């Protein structure tokens, strides 16, 4: 469809190894940054501690809670708490969850993220569900209790972005490479005896044509064709991270044309 060009190599519920082509490095890189820091998501951002006899401090547990990946499928149908016209929080802008655990058995009692319970009305939108990916349906191990120890909390999820705090980040890592063959000469290889022999060859060198001995430096060739690979943290489908990233960046660029308008 003319313009940017996607060419997926791998795909799954966790990673999207693809190949952006026919685009400026800037755009490629801008998208890379947006996926990392500006894609809306839901995450614990308030914890009320009623009972805590655990070996961990409140802020310690609180901190971890906020790091628990939460379902953010329909995150767009959840207003930012700072915008919402209510007082503090409500179902229109926040998801409330509870955690109640008691050291009953004699063996250590594990408090996972599955033990979290939504207490607010989700209104039918896929949101707030603690993400689970372990072959045991336990999820993230929040804390541990000895017989007698108790923990009664109340978390208030909220929509946020990574820029404000990494917890709100939907992405994990983002492989990024271009010109596996240093034809553009964007880098000067360090060596002892042999540049090529000492430097490991990249995966993407296969997906490209090795330079030819005689050909003089192609001083016009620019930087297009970037070999990426996104990895979702779970709060959002892998493909979504990309798509929504592309969309978010698109919004920013638009928020500026609108500024020129009312200017």
């Amino acid at each position: 469809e003319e313009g940017p060009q996607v060419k997926i190599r791998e795909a799954s519920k966790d990673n999207v190894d693809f190949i952006l082509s026919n685009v400026d490095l800037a755009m490629a890189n801008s998208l890379r940054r947006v996926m990392i820091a500006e894609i809306p998501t839901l995450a614990i951002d308030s914890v009320e501690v009623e009972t805590n006899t655990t070996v961990l401090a409140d802020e310690f547990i609180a901190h971890r809670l906020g790091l628990i990946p939460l379902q953010s499928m329909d995150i767009e149908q959840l207003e930012y708490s700072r915008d919402c016209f209510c007082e503090d929080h409500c179902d229109k802008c926040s998801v409330v969850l509870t955690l109640q655990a008691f050291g009953e058995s004699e063996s250590t009692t594990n408090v996972y993220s599955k033990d979290l319970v939504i207490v607010s009305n989700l209104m039918g939108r896929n949101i707030g569900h603690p993400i689970i990916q372990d072959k045991e349906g336990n999820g993230v191990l929040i804390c541990k209790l000895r017989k007698g120890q108790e923990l009664k909390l109340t978390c208030v999820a909220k929509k946020g972005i990574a820029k404000e705090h990494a917890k709100w980040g939907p992405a994990a890592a983002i492989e990024f490479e271009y010109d596996p063959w240093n034809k553009l000469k964007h880098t000067d290889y360090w060596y002892e005896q042999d540049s090529a022999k000492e430097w490991p060859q990249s995966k993407n060198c296969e997906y490209e044509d090795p330079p030819n001995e005689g050909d003089p430096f192609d001083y016009k060739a620019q930087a297009d064709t970037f070999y990426m690979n996104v990895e979702s943290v779970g709060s959002i489908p892998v493909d979504q991270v990309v798509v929504r990233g592309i969309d978010t960046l698109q919004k920013k660029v638009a928020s500026i044309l609108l500024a020129l308008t009312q200017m």
Binding site: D45, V49, N52, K167
Partner: protein, 46 residues
């Protein structure tokens, strides 16, 4: 109801004022702990 002070070892809830010495019941320990308040504490999950 209530639980002003708590014992260090037996963890048995105590509660007394002045002239009431500074011990606990059964356990002659003289430590005692303040016991967390009821006013719920809020936290920034950041």
């Amino acid at each position: 109801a209530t639980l002003k002070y708590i014992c260090a070892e037996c963890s048995s809830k105590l509660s007394l004022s002045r002239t009431d010495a500074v011990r606990c019941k059964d356990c002659g320990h003289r430590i005692l702990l303040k016991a967390r308040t009821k006013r719920l504490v809020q936290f920034e999950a950041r």
